[PDB]
């Protein structure tokens, strides 16, 4: 019936799309996620949102979701939609491999997903997914990459981005400490830790409020490895030391 | 293959041999032909072994669902009805022949099921390629209201007669005894043949 | 008390309290007919009694019945909207026949009740249709347990009872039956018809004539669902 | 609020009543029927001198003996033009003869009003069209000129004008026309009225003109002949 | 016959905490050889291989669909598959086409991921799984390798003696088949090693 | 299935959904294109480059075929869908008729799609405007322009987006057969036509040229940088 | 029958084919093209039933061109061979299966030359030389005798000439002319034709 | 034939108030409690009948799904029944394909996918129920929880229904990681006892356990002994 319809897919008197404008503000309040590209690999570093003592850490991660032998992602927004999107990405990668007998490139994966995100804004009467993604990967043609999608369905390659909460100030401080071409993985980790330390309202990090993954090429093979609590603690100690020494 | 079941005083006894062939050559020497359907219902199979496996697995899944949904023991009549309805729906193209048997709240039952979907309830029955050899022994020695040990003796002798007179059977004898309380499975029950030293 | 926001009182969507107002209105629709039923189960018998108030004397009252037969050993009594109840009785008959056709034996009372209840739960969720405004009560003999008495409702809730009562006077007609399950197993013998008639009369003050009720019966001695004659009803009434 | 199909207290079909108002915002066209053929003429209404004028096609050819001139939503008119072409070719294929202007106007008018939003078709229209048409041609009875509306009502005319200045264009066409014209005086007067009512200056690149006559095919005027005619006037 | 149109021969044997699988290399059409490096054994897991024989197009298709499904499974669950689970999945895949089936007979050989207990099995064209404890064969010289394995097999063998036996069986089996040969490759799946070898055979 | 009339008429015969789509396309970054003697050129403005992107992934100038290219304004997510459908159409035409498409053929295809999304049930209109250029087998350059309504024209030179209201007045007065004689003349014309709308100063512009040879060549930042100095 | 051949060298993939287009006892054409270029470095050769060849080959070519136009780089020979096998196998059990025998030659910026064989059942191989047709039986043993893994292009054309001469002497069909071209680093290069006037 | 438009939409602040309202519905059910011990899990509910007329034996709140999984709920019973039926079907399909019993995590993922589908389709409302799943596979006990939106977690001790805040506030203190299953039952019962407003009885509550041998709900004769202490 027409009385109960909410008209999710129409234009506004100024050319806007209100449901997408509201899903973006939904994504505005999620947990902070950040990525950084370097000479020898990429890295993700999210923030743990559920810190209750009575929880269980059975999973190898909370917001990583290895998608393929060469890629991985991270989400912000609604977990329920995130699960659907992750299943779809895995299916797309396997269909590509079945047709060509080679792994898929990262831009083709991101494109095939953003088409699905866009088809939810033009017809159907449904509502759109309230999820933003970051991707990392490695392929034959361009090597280490790092992308980002949004609810509307448009993406873009970056070198150091950030979504979630306080991502504005995160990117603002990222612009002044990133130097193109000279960054190694260790300086990347240092900058990531020192950005996460500020853009989180808490007094100081805890090595369990964070979650860190990297990506490298070793012996003609891609390795995607989530860092461990002790490693993270050591990194935090290193950050604590040098910062303290300066002043 | 030779399968044979009997109805004694307080339950059922089924049996089979353990040789699978492919043409004229022995493929397996321990092929198992007595399948689980429910904690009180079992089944034997002859014919296209892939069809037997598929059909019995599907029926076992359906019966587990039905029992979970009602909350009580399932029934041999329900299993028989499901099987025959499927087999008739497929017009004989699924080539399985079955010796379903169990014990429910009503007592011991024993059915025969054929590839086209026709059924028949009986007190004893045989199937396979040595079915005539086992049926001769059954006709010659079956007595109503028998006891457990003699039922086991009779069914093992029928299976042995099928094994020694049929080129497509041999190598071992399984037995499965179902009563109102127990559920006894005897996989290496008899070993009439031993390889030369 | 419970605020509203949007289309809450027009379709089956959650209120700011999670209340589903459009389902609280079918309960009020139940009280529109103006009748009352009472079912009591005994040690070897289940009994149904139903008010029979015809408006005036031009109707052929041999057709105004609230008692129905589902299978040979299952009987039912409706309360609420008449055409709704007819559609529900047709659905129950079809379910009961399909069960026998599929599985080879006769459907139990609780299985039939659960089927009707999940059929109604769907009307509680989709927005294009409305819930049926009627209640249902079932009786029968289970070969394993014995007598059974079950009741559904427009929300999809299908508990089981020792002695029920549905209709306009539900609260007090159950407050009466509350006092009598204290001892003697609520007179667990074939004369629970006395208890049913007494409970129906206590809060209505009618002292019914030999033809303003209907009664139905199943027994362990004869399992089929029988509808007692006027003379039989009169004898019980006369004894009272 | 309402649906697309909804009568009014006068039984008027709101959406059709609006699609009709969508025509008083187009550029004027004019057709005229003679005993020697028909002529069509339409203003081009150039916007800025950077737009190519040879890219405004408002007078198309349906077949070797029928032409059409439109006004309204030029984006909408194209499906109608395509379907008319296809129908004429089907008629040739099946009966080995040419269709008739009456039959083409009638078949095109049957697409109007075929809209709705429930149990209509797999892919169906959601609103009425917003184009008025003008057919011309010759057949086994002679030159004919028809007119079509978004409501689906088609008439037969001898001098019709559609557009945003028609209430003023017909007030002159009714005085100019007579049953004893020749196509040449027809062309002259059809140009004089255009010049009368337009906002710009009637020169040889902001107008269009075509003619069908019993002898020849559908033929469009050239920037040579057109210029000569304008200068001659 | 259709399953005798490209030839082929696969074989698996079980030892004491070790498995072994072997195949031939010839790829040809009815009576003419084309290449001699055809792959018929696929690494489904860390210590879990599958060998396919029959029509070569269906060998390739079934291998590719199986890799599809196994990748999806190991991404969704979070661990590696077991030999028993893989056999059921392959049987389901083959039975989905009960009418109009693939012409291929697979063979599985692996090690239990936590007890390191061997496993061998073979399936028929329609998906009938038979698990054994000594050896399985499949191909055009099935009877020849039956005759070889029954005589040469022993229980509780070392990897060395297992390799010797499976190689000595495959050689003499394919030396009497017209549409098999051109060399043999042998994989030895131990607990912490996977040794591969190529034997010298006849090329006629 | 969703079957509702999203875009419908209004009093005074307006289509509010199409008018809103155009109000949206009036907010993109400016694009400019001209038609040369033996060359065709386009040019798009970059609002901000953000010092951290990879420009290889945010290009607003694609290539539909060997001889056709386009550039848009509006919504990138809709532009991508339109572009891929146009690519599939070019391949189908090549397959069936054994000849590369004309520019007007692909312009008609795109405009037909855009119009179909204004009269179907359960859809909103596209929110982009395109400029299509290229060469044909004759050797004649073309330049067209579509609208969210499905109407298209052919132009000497045009500008879409914001600031086009002044870019058009500038280009109208300055376009003449003299600034057309050579490629390094027309390119400076386009550059100074874009610069007075770019209020940032310098080059925040992408510029692609397409000649009868070495198709869809894209000028490097350094090369485009040289021309700016020459103008001053 | 039509003729096809391919020879892979250190950095070249020399191929060849014939030019006859017979219909019946007559010859309809004399210079027919059995090579379909699909990319700047990929060639596709076809034989078999009329209609099937061209219908099948043009479909592959349009899909390869579309891939390039979408993604900004070209397919590799391996990807093209696998795409071809897939599309050919998916039609095998459908309502209309093709009857084409193929040969894919290529060259890539990492792995070098590549030569793929594919019969009409969609089984894909990789070889240092191959051939389709009835003349394959006669020319497969000259290549066996004289091929070398490090052969140069000067000698490769020599060997191909020897094969074609053997065909001229010993075949019962009349095949007078053959196309010859090479795919090296610099794309495809048409070469001199070989005629036996 | 059915509506095709969504009934859950975004608000000017990015909220989904239909899901928030389904959660407000869940916050008004009956208390539930789960506690994972070193060798098993425990589910304990409040099965309080309205009056003495109701036959208690007929309806249960603690149900099995397979031979090793069982669950309880809080919220709406008619919705709980639909979820139970679809979970049983999901487990049977998995066993049909793999000839293996499904793991608890895969079960929870599929159930939460269904619950999520009911937040974005046309013409439906979300479920008004949260679940508490139990299981044991590969020598380890599991305990998950599913929300009306489709988001699932993993806990060591949780609490639903009315007075869940104080429930988990009390649950945090006592919980030990070395706790045996028999001594965990006391804490589960005690937690329920804090907010009961009445007198405990063998028919006021339901209790299910899961260890190495499978899932089963305790019988009133055993609940009696456990309540004696």
UniProtKB/Swiss-Prot annotation, chain C:
Cellular localization per UniProt: Cytoplasm; Nucleus
The record ties this protein, via InterPro entries, to: Ntn_hydrolases_N (IPR029055), Proteasome_alpha (IPR050115), Proteasome_alpha-type (IPR023332), Proteasome_asu_N (IPR000426), Proteasome_sua/b (IPR001353), Proteasome_subunit_alpha6 (IPR034642)
Q: Give the sugar-modified residues.
A: 3
SUPFAM superfamilies given in the database record = N-terminal nucleophile aminohydrolases (Ntn hydrolases)
Q: Where are the transmembrane segments?
A: none
Q: Which UniProt keywords apply?
A: Acetylation, Cytoplasm, Glycoprotein, Nucleus, Phosphoprotein, Proteasome
Q: Which residues carry this modification: N6-acetyllysine?
A: 100, 102
Instruction: Show the PROSITE patterns listed in the entry.
Output: PROTEASOME_ALPHA_1, PROTEASOME_ALPHA_2
Q: Which GO terms describe its molecular function?
A: NF-kappaB binding; RNA binding
The main place the protein resides is cytoplasm
Does the UniProt entry include the keyword Disulfide bond? no
Q: Give residue numbers for the modification (Phosphoserine).
A: 15, 61-62
In-chain residues carrying the UniProt-annotated modification Phosphotyrosine: 157
- Record GO biological process: positive regulation of canonical NF-kappaB signal transduction; proteasome-mediated ubiquitin-dependent protein catabolic process; proteolysis involved in protein catabolic process
Q: Which GO terms describe its cellular component?
A: cytoplasm; myofibril; nuclear matrix; nucleus; P-body; proteasome complex; proteasome core complex; proteasome core complex, alpha-subunit complex
Q: Which Pfam families match?
A: Proteasome, Proteasome_A_N
Q: Does the keyword Metal-binding apply?
A: no
Q: What does this protein do?
A: Component of the 20S core proteasome complex involved in the proteolytic degradation of most intracellular proteins. This complex plays numerous essential roles within the cell by associating with different regulatory particles. Associated with two 19S regulatory particles, forms the 26S proteasome and thus participates in the ATP-dependent degradation of ubiquitinated proteins.
Q: Which family does it belong to?
A: Belongs to the peptidase T1A family.
- What protein name does the entry list? Proteasome subunit alpha type-6
Swiss-Prot record, chain D:
- Keyword Ribosomal protein (UniProt): no
What's a single GO CC term here?
nucleus
Q: Which residues are glycosylated?
A: 190
* Record InterPro entries: Ntn_hydrolases_N (IPR029055), Proteasome_alpha (IPR050115), Proteasome_alpha-type (IPR023332), Proteasome_alpha_type_5 (IPR033812), Proteasome_asu_N (IPR000426), Proteasome_sua/b (IPR001353)
Q: Which PROSITE patterns does the record match to this protein?
A: PROTEASOME_ALPHA_1, PROTEASOME_ALPHA_2
Instruction: Give the subcellular location.
Output: Cytoplasm; Nucleus
Q: Which UniProt keywords apply?
A: Acetylation, Cytoplasm, Glycoprotein, Nucleus, Phosphoprotein, Proteasome
Chief location: cytoplasm
Residues bearing Phosphothreonine are: 47
GO-annotated biological processes = proteasome-mediated ubiquitin-dependent protein catabolic process
| Physiological role | Component of the 20S core proteasome complex involved in the proteolytic degradation of most intracellular proteins. This complex plays numerous essential roles within the cell by associating with different regulatory particles. Associated with two 19S regulatory particles, forms the 26S proteasome and thus participates in the ATP-dependent degradation of ubiquitinated proteins.
Name the family: Belongs to the peptidase T1A family.
Sorted alphabetically, which NCBIfam families does this protein's record hold? Answer: PRK03996.1 (NF003075)
The protein in question is named: Proteasome subunit alpha type-5
GN (gene name): Psma5
UniProtKB/Swiss-Prot annotation, chain E:
| Keywords from the named record | Acetylation, Cytoplasm, Nucleus, Proteasome
- Location(s), subcellular: Cytoplasm; Nucleus
The answer to whether the entry has keyword Transmembrane is: no
| Residues that span the membrane, as ranges | none
Determine the domain of life of the protein's source: Eukaryota
Extract one GO BP annotation from the record: proteasome-mediated ubiquitin-dependent protein catabolic process
**What InterPro entries does this protein's entry cite?**
Ntn_hydrolases_N, Proteasome_beta_3, Proteasome_bsu_CS, Proteasome_sua/b, Proteasome_suB-type
What Gene3D superfamilies does the record point to? Glutamine Phosphoribosylpyrophosphate, subunit 1, domain 1 (3.60.20.10)
Q: Which residues carry this modification: N-acetylserine?
A: 1
**Major localization class:** cytoplasm
GO CC annotations on file? cytoplasm; cytosol; nucleus; proteasome complex; proteasome core complex; proteasome core complex, beta-subunit complex
Acetylation is among the record's keywords: yes
Modification N6-acetyllysine occurs at: 76
Q: Which Pfam families does UniProt cross-reference here?
A: Proteasome
What is its biological role?
A: Non-catalytic component of the 20S core proteasome complex involved in the proteolytic degradation of most intracellular proteins. This complex plays numerous essential roles within the cell by associating with different regulatory particles. Associated with two 19S regulatory particles, forms the 26S proteasome and thus participates in the ATP-dependent degradation of ubiquitinated proteins.
Oligomeric state and interaction partners are given as:
The 26S proteasome consists of a 20S proteasome core and two 19S regulatory subunits. The 20S proteasome core is a barrel-shaped complex made of 28 subunits that are arranged in four stacked rings. The two outer rings are each formed by seven alpha subunits, and the two inner rings are formed by seven beta subunits. The proteolytic activity is exerted by three beta-subunits PSMB5, PSMB6 and PSMB7.
Swiss-Prot record, chain H:
Q: Which UniProt keywords apply?
A: Acetylation, Cytoplasm, Nucleus, Phosphoprotein, Proteasome
InterPro entries assigned to the protein according to its UniProt record, in alphabetical order: Ntn_hydrolases_N, Proteasome_alpha, Proteasome_alpha-type, Proteasome_asu_N, Proteasome_sua/b
User: Which residues in this protein are found as Phosphotyrosine?
Assistant: 3, 21, 73, 118
GO CC terms: cytoplasm; nucleus; P-body; proteasome complex; proteasome core complex; proteasome core complex, alpha-subunit complex
Entry PTM: Phosphorylated on tyrosine residues; which may be important for nuclear import.
Q: Organism's domain of life?
A: Eukaryota
Q: Where in the cell is it found?
A: Cytoplasm; Nucleus
| Tissue and organ expression note | Ubiquitous.
Among Pfam families, the record links this protein to: Proteasome, Proteasome_A_N
Q: For the modification N6-acetyllysine, which residues carry it?
A: 67, 168
Q: Name one GO biological process term.
A: response to virus
Give residue numbers for the modification (Phosphoserine).
4, 11, 13
According to its UniProt entry, what is the function of this protein?
Answer: Component of the 20S core proteasome complex involved in the proteolytic degradation of most intracellular proteins. This complex plays numerous essential roles within the cell by associating with different regulatory particles. Associated with two 19S regulatory particles, forms the 26S proteasome and thus participates in the ATP-dependent degradation of ubiquitinated proteins.
* Family per record: Belongs to the peptidase T1A family.
Which protein, by its recorded name, is this? Proteasome subunit alpha type-2
Instruction: Please report the organism this UniProt entry assigns to the protein.
Output: Rattus norvegicus
């Amino acid at each position: 019936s027409r009385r109960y319809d909410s008209r999710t897919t129409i234009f506004s008197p100024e050319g806007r799309l209100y449901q997408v404008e509201y899903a973006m503000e939904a994504i505005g309040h999620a947990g902070t996620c950040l990525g950084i590209l370097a000479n020898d690999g990429v890295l993700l570093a999210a923030e743990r949102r559920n810190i209750h003592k009575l929880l269980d850490e059975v999973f190898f991660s909370e917001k990583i979701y290895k998608l393929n032998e060469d890629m991985a992602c991270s989400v912000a927004g609604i977990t329920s939609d995130a699960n659907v999107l992750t299943n779809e990405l895995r299916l797309i990668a396997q269909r590509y491999l079945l047709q060509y007998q080679e792994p898929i490139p990262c831009e083709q994966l991101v494109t095939a997903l953003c088409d699905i995100k866009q088809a939810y804004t033009q017809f159907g009467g449904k509502r759109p997914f309230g999820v933003s993604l970051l991707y990392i990967g490695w392929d034959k043609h361009y090597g280490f990459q790092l992308y980002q999608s949004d609810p509307s369905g448009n993406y873009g390659g970056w070198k150091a981005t950030c979504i979630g909460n306080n991502s504005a100030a995160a990117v603002s401080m990222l612009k002044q400490d990133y130097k193109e071409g000279e960054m190694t993985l260790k300086s990347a980790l240092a900058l990531a830790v020192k950005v996460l330390n500020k853009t989180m309202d808490v007094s100081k990090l805890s090595a369990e409020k964070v979650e860190i993954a990297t990506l490298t090429r070793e012996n003609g093979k891609t390795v995607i490895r989530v860092l461990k609590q002790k490693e993270v603690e050591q990194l935090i100690k290193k950050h604590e030391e040098e910062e303290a020494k300066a002043e | 293959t030779t399968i044979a079941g009997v109805v004694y005083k307080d339950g059922i006894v089924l049996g089979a041999d353990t040789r699978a062939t492919e043409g004229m050559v022995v493929a397996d020497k321990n092929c198992s032909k007595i399948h689980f359907i429910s904690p009180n219902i079992y089944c034997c199979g002859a014919g296209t072994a892939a069809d037997t496996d598929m059909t019995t697995q599907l029926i076992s899944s359906n019966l587990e669902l039905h029992s979970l949904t009602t909350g009580r023991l399932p029934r041999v009549v329900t299993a028989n009805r499901m099987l025959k309805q499927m087999l008739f729906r497929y017009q004989g193209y699924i080539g399985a022949a079955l010796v379903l048997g169990g014990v429910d709240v009503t007592g011991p039952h024993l059915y025969s099921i054929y590839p086209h979907g026709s059924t028949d309830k009986l007190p004893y029955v045989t199937m396979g390629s040595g079915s005539l050899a086992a049926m001769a022994v059954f006709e010659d020695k079956f007595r109503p209201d028998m006891e457990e040990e003699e039922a086991k003796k009779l069914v093992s002798e029928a299976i042995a007669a099928g094994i020694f007179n049929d080129l497509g059977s041999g190598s071992n004898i399984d037995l499965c005894v179902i009563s109102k309380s127990k559920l006894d499975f005897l996989r290496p029950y008899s070993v009439p043949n031993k390889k030369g030293t | 008390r419970g605020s509203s926001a949007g289309f809450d009182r027009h379709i089956t969507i959650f209120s700011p309290e999670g209340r589903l107002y459009q389902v609280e209105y079918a309960f009020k629709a139940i009280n529109q007919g103006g009748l009352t039923s009472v079912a009591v189960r005994g040690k070897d018998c289940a009994v149904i009694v139903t008010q029979k108030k015809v408006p005036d004397k031009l109707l052929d009252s041999s057709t105004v019945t609230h008692l129905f037969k589902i299978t040979e050993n299952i009987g039912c009594v409706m309360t609420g909207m008449t055409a709704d109840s007819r559609s529900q009785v047709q659905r129950a008959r079809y379910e009961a026949a399909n069960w026998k056709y599929k599985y080879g034996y006769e459907i139990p009372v609780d299985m039939l009740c659960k089927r009707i209840a999940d059929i109604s739960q769907v009307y509680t969720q989709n927005a294009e249709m409305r819930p049926l405004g009627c209640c249902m009560i079932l009786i029968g003999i289970d070969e394993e347990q014995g007598p059974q008495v079950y009741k559904c409702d427009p929300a999809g809730y299908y508990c089981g009872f020792k002695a029920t009562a549905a209709g306009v006077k539900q609260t007090e007609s159950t407050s009466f039956l509350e006092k009598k399950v204290k001892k003697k197993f609520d007179w667990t013998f074939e004369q629970t018809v006395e208890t049913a008639i007494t409970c129906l009369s206590t809060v209505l003050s009618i002292d019914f004539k030999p033809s303003e009720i209907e009664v139905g019966v199943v027994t362990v001695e004869n399992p089929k669902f029988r509808i007692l004659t006027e003379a039989e009803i009169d004898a019980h009434l006369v004894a009272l | 609020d309402r649906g697309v199909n909804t009568f009014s207290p006068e039984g008027r079909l709101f959406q059709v009543e609006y699609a009709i108002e969508g025509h008083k915002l187009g550029s004027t066209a004019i057709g005229i029927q003679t005993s020697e053929g028909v002529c069509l003429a339409v203003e081009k209404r150039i916007t800025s001198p950077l737009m190519e004028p040879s890219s405004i096609e408002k007078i198309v050819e349906i077949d070797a003996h029928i032409g059409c001139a439109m006004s309204g939503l030029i984006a909408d008119a194209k499906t109608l033009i395509d379907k008319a072409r296809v129908e004429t070719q089907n008629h040739w294929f099946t009966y080995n003869e040419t269709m008739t202007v009456e039959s083409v106007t009638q078949a095109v008018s049957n697409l109007a009003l075929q809209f709705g939003e429930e149990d209509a078709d797999p892919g169906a229209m959601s609103r009425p069209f917003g184009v008025a048409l003008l057919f011309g041609g010759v057949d086994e009875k002679g030159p004919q000129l028809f007119h079509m509306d978004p409501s689906g009502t088609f008439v037969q005319c001898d001098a019709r004008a559609i557009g945003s200045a028609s209430e003023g264009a017909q007030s002159s066409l009714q005085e100019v026309y007579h049953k004893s014209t020749t196509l040449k005086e027809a062309i002259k007067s059809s140009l004089i009225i255009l010049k009368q009512v337009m906002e710009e200056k009637l020169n040889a690149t902001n107008i269009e003109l075509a003619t069908v006559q019993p002898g020849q095919n559908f033929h469009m005027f050239t920037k040579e002949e057109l210029e000569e005619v304008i200068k001659d006037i | 016959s259709v399953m005798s149109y490209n030839g082929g021969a696969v074989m698996a044997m079980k030892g004491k905490n070790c498995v072994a699988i072997a195949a031939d290399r010839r790829f040809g059409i009815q009576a003419q050889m084309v290449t001699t490096d055809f792959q018929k054994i696929f690494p489904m897991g860390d210590r879990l291989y599958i060998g396919l024989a029959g029509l070569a197009t269906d060998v390739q298709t079934v291998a590719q669909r199986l890799k599809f499904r196994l990748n999806l499974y190991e991404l969704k669950e979070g661990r590696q598959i077991k030999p028993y689970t893989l056999m059921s999945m392959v049987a389901n895949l083959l039975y989905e086409k009960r009418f109009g089936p693939y012409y291929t007979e697979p063979v599985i050989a692996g090690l239990d991921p936590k007890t390191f207990k061997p496993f061998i099995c073979s399936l028929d064209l329609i998906g009938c799984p038979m698990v054994t404890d000594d050896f399985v064969v499949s191909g055009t010289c099935s009877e020849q390798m039956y005759g070889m394995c029954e005589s040469l097999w022993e229980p509780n063998m070392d990897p060395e003696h297992l390799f010797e036996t499976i190689s000595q069986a495959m050689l003499n089996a394919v030396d009497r088949d017209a549409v098999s040969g051109m060399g043999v490759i042998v994989h030895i799946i131990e607990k912490d090693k996977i040794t591969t070898r190529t034997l010298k055979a006849r090329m006629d | 299935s969703y079957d509702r009339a999203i875009t419908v008429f209004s009093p005074d015969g307006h289509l509010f959904q199409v008018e809103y789509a155009q109000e949206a396309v009036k907010k993109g970054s400016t694009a400019v294109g001209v038609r040369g003697r033996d060359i065709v050129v386009l040019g798009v403005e970059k609002k901000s480059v953000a010092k951290l992107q990879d420009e290889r992934t945010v290009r607003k100038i694609c290539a539909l075929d060997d001889n056709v290219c386009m550039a848009f304004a509006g919504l990138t997510a809709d532009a991508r869908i339109v572009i891929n459908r146009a690519r599939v159409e070019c391949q189908s035409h090549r397959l069936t008729v054994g000849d590369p498409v004309t520019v007007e053929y692909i312009t008609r295809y795109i405009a037909s799609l855009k119009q179909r999304y204004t009269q179907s049930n359960g859809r909103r209109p596209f929110g982009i405007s395109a400029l299509i250029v290229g060469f044909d087998f004759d050797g004649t350059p073309r330049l067209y322009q579509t609208d969210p309504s499905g109407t298209y024209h052919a132009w000497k030179a045009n500008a879409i987006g914001r600031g086009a209201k002044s870019v058009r007045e500038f280009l109208e007065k300055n376009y003449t057969d003299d600034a057309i004689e050579t490629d390094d003349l027309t390119i400076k014309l386009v550059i100074k036509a874009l610069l007075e709308v770019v209020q940032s100063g310098g080059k925040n512009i992408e510029l692609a040229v397409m000649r009868r040879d070495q198709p869809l060549k894209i000028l490097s930042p350094e090369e485009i940088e040289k021309y700016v100095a020459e103008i001053e | 029958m039509e003729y096809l051949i391919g020879i892979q060298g250190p950095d070249y993939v020399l191929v060849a084919s014939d030019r006859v287009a017979a219909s019946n006892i007559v010859q309809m054409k004399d210079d027919h093209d059995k090579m379909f270029k699909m990319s700047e470095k990929i060639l596709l050769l076809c034989v078999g039933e009329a209609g099937d060849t061209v219908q099948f080959a043009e479909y592959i070519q349009k899909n390869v061109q579309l891939y390039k136009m979408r993604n900004g780089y070209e397919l590799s020979p391996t990807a093209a061979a696998n795409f071809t096998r897939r599309n050919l196998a998916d039609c095998l059990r459908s309502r209309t299966p093709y009857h084409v025998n193929l040969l894919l030659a290529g060259y890539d910026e990492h792995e070098g030359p590549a030569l793929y064989y594919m019969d009409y059942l969609a089984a894909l191989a990789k070889a240092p030389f191959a051939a389709h047709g009835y003349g394959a039986f006669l020319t497969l043993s000259i290549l066996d005798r004289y091929y070398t893994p490090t052969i140069s292009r000067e000698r490769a054309v020599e060997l191909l000439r020897k094969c074609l001469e053997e065909l001229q002497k010993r075949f019962i069909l009349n095949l007078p002319t053959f196309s010859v071209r090479v795919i090296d680093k610099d794309g495809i290069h048409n070469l001199e034709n070989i005629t036996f006037t | 034939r059915g509506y095709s438009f969504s009934l859950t939409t975004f608000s000017p602040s990015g909220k989904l108030v239909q899901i928030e309202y389904a959660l407000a519905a869940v916050a008004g059910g009956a208390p539930s409690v789960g506690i994972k011990a070193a060798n098993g899990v425990v589910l304990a509910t409040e099965k309080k009948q309205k009056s003495i007329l109701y036959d208690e034996r007929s309806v249960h709140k603690v149900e099995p799904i397979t031979k090793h999984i069982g669950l309880v709920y809080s919220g709406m019973g008619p919705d709980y029944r639909v979820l139970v039926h679809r979970a049983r079907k999901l487990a049977q399909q998995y066993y049909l394909v793999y000839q293996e019993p499904i793991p608890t995590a895969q079960l929870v993922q599929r159930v939460a996918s269904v619950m999520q589908e009911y937040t974005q389709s046309g013409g439906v409302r979300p479920f008004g129920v949260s679940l508490l799943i139990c299981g044991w596979n590969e020598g380890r006990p599991y305990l998950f929880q599913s929300d009306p939106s489709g988001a699932y977690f993993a806990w060591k001790a949780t609490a639903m229904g009315k007075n869940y805040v104080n429930g988990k506030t009390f649950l945090e203190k006592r919980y030990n990681e070395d706790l045996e299953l028999e001594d965990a039952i006391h804490t589960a019962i005690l937690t329920l006892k804090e907010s009961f407003e009445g007198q405990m009885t063998e028919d006021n509550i339901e209790v299910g356990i899961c260890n190495e041998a499978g899932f089963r709900r305790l019988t009133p004769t055993e609940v009696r002994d456990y309540l004696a202490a």
